[PDB]
């Protein structure tokens, strides 16, 4: 009979409770105080303009119909009580396919404080949409947003707020760093009003600032393209009479330049404009053709030539001048 005390409390709270109506329907505005604990920021898929994020989506509001007087102040209740009470219909504005985890029980909790303050946290994975601007690929920064708010309740019915200070209302766990390509720098939050045909809704916006690490693309694209240009420019060090030998340098370097041009263009989506990596490839695609038509010049005029004695110095020079000015205008933005 020791648990009949707590049984009679919960049967009394739900007696006459209407869970289809928000608390304070005709009196005030239901302030829902929220904060996010990010257990792991998942990988950003740049092909699909999306990122995954695992949150502990905490919410808290006030309900005056759930007041109780008992032996304990807080009621760390089971999960199935949360479906028998009013909970806010917070959806994500830019979510795409986001899953609430169900193993083994539903991963939600509900705590009811004795004055009527409620806490209701959910464990979610959110496959949100991050519109990114790939002009400075791969030396680019992105601010992937996560916008959430009410669905059916306007700004005169349910308003949102942060629990702690807005600097301390989105926390990222230290061990959760599932990004392999990008680099999370920090998070900034905001609040505002959106306009719809049904009404005005309070939106809650947070941004996750990411900077892409270029260490993968140096050893995949930037160094094999540099080594191809040097492989094209060693052809000036040969003799004029080796016509089949120098055209092996001419053909195979431009044939491996156009494979990297493609092998590299498949990473990022079908982009209409040209990225900053495509400006490095196209200039390097011009240096191998500038070496190939240099050989066709000296083969048509076939002692040592003044063309090869000038292209042995100018071609490593003008490639170095471009290489100095390309990185300095992009790494220091």
């Amino acid at each position: 009979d020791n648990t009949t005390v707590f049984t009679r409390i919960l049967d009394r709270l739900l007696d006459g409770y209407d869970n289809r109506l928000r608390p304070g329907l005709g009196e005030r505005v239901t302030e829902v105080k929220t904060d996010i604990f990010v257990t792991s920021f998942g990988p950003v898929s740049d092909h699909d303009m999306e990122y995954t994020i695992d949150v502990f989506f905490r919410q808290s509001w006030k309900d005056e119909r759930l007041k109780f007087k008992g032996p304990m102040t807080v009621l760390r209740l089971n999960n199935l009580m949360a479906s028998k009470i009013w909970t806010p219909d917070t959806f994500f504005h830019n979510g795409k396919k986001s899953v609430a985890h169900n193993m083994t029980m539903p991963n939600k909790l509900l705590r009811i404080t004795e004055d009527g303050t409620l806490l209701y946290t959910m464990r979610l994975t959110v496959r949100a949409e991050c519109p990114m601007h790939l002009e400075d690929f791969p030396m680019d920064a992105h601010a992937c947003p996560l916008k959430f708010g009410s669905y059916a309740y306007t700004r005169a019915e349910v308003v949102y707020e942060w629990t702690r200070e807005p600097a301390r209302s989105v926390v990222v766990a230290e061990d959760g760093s599932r990004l392999n390509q990008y680099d999370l720098l920090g998070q900034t939050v905001d609040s505002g009003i959106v306009q719809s045909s049904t009404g005005e809704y309070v939106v809650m916006t947070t941004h996750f600032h990411l900077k892409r690490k270029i260490g993968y693309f140096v050893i995949q694209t930037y160094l094999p393209c540099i080594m191809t240009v040097i492989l094209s420019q060693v052809s000036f060090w040969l003799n004029r009479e080796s016509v089949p030998a120098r055209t092996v340098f001419g053909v195979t370097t431009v044939l491996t330049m156009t494979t990297l041009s493609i092998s590299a263009r498949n990473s990022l989506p079908k982009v209409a404009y040209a990225t900053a990596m495509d400006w490095f490839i196209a200039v390097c695609y011009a240096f191998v053709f500038s070496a190939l038509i240099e050989f066709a010049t000296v083969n048509y005029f076939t002692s040592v030539s003044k063309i090869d004695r000038l292209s042995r110095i100018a071609f490593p020079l003008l490639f170095g001048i471009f290489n100095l000015v390309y990185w300095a205008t992009y790494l220091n933005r």
Partner: antibody
Amino acid sequence: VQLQQSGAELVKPGASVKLSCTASGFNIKDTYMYWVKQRPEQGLEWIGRIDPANGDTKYDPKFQGKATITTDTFSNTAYLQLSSLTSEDTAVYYCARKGLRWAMDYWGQGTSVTVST
Amino acid sequence: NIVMTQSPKSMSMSVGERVTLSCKASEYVGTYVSWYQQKPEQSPKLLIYGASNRYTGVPDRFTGSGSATDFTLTIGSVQAEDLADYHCGQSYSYPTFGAGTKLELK
């Protein structure tokens, strides 16, 4: 609605002072309590905040070890505590609460401290 | 820590014209930038909670504009009851305030 503070006091330097801010029309357990230092002909200066639900208190880095706040739920009043006050801290103390967008909507009438002879 | 600078320190204008306040933060404060007036030997009150969101009871001549860093308070027509200096605050972190901006009437 109505925010009330106690009247002004005269204190000697090196002594301790007690200052109160009584809230009426609303309970303290849901909204934060903000206290702010207003020097004469100068701007405002926040000194500390109070979360009365769990008793959490976070101070300004300048005023660490200078101010202390206790808050009684039954008395509907929060208390100042200035232990090592000097003669430079001659100002008026205002009471505030967290508003709609973390603003300070309701303010007290303000109590001015005076440290002289 | 966050610092707020209000420019200029003071100004002197008459009744019924345009004034533009200025308030710039050290780093990003999103929208939680509050404007407070201080009538002499009274208590402060609230003008704009958040950015560009008027409080209840203040006249419609007061308006603001919000951004990431810079925030302005604009009064279309200065009246005879606005004898107060205006303080620009912030709330994205632990709150801090500017030095205020005094004004006077001819």
